[PDB]
Design a protein around this ligand. Sequence first.
Ligand code: NAG
Length: 208
Amino acid sequence: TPPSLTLSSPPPTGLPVSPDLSQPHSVTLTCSAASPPARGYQYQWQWRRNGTLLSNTHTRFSITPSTNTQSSSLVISGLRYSDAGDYMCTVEYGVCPDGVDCSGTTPVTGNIHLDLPLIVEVDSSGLVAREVVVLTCEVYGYPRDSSPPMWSSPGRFNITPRYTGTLSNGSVSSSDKVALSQLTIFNVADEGEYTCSVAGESASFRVD
Ligand SMILES: *[C@@H]1O[C@H](CO)[C@@H](O)[C@H](O)[C@H]1NC(C)=O
């Protein structure tokens, strides 16, 4: 007798989510049932990560239903790269009127895929007198490991480490980028692509 229950989001193929990289310390994941509960009914939600039920007793995870229970949001705080990947949201009937049988209704689970990128940028001073170009390798997002930046350029100068500490236990705002390294060119023949590589990611600047 009870109304049907399915998810509008995520769909069967899952939902990708990525954070606001200007405010990277937390992200909100939301799932929604396709229809609101009828009068006298409520939905109940469960969230899982790594096979494991999440609840509000967890420090970095906070779950909140909508007023009508049609949706549920998980806020992950203290975000770091290792939080990336799949999260599962499951909806079921939580309350049903007496004399309605909800026990035949199967819970519905969706998958959210949380993408936590690491972006590299190579910025230039321009040619300046301190004779010289200074390139700075900067990152933002979610550093994966402690791998130092590696500079490259086909063929081929001072490399000064800038920030050398660990960033993989947290995140870096796109409007508070971290400088990892600087390539100084002392002194036409130096024109061309210079690349900074930080683990799997890279960016270039063409010095002309
Ligand atoms: C989930 O599993 C991965 C792989 O073992 C791990 O890096 C991560 O810390 C685990 N915990 C969370 C909350 O993502």
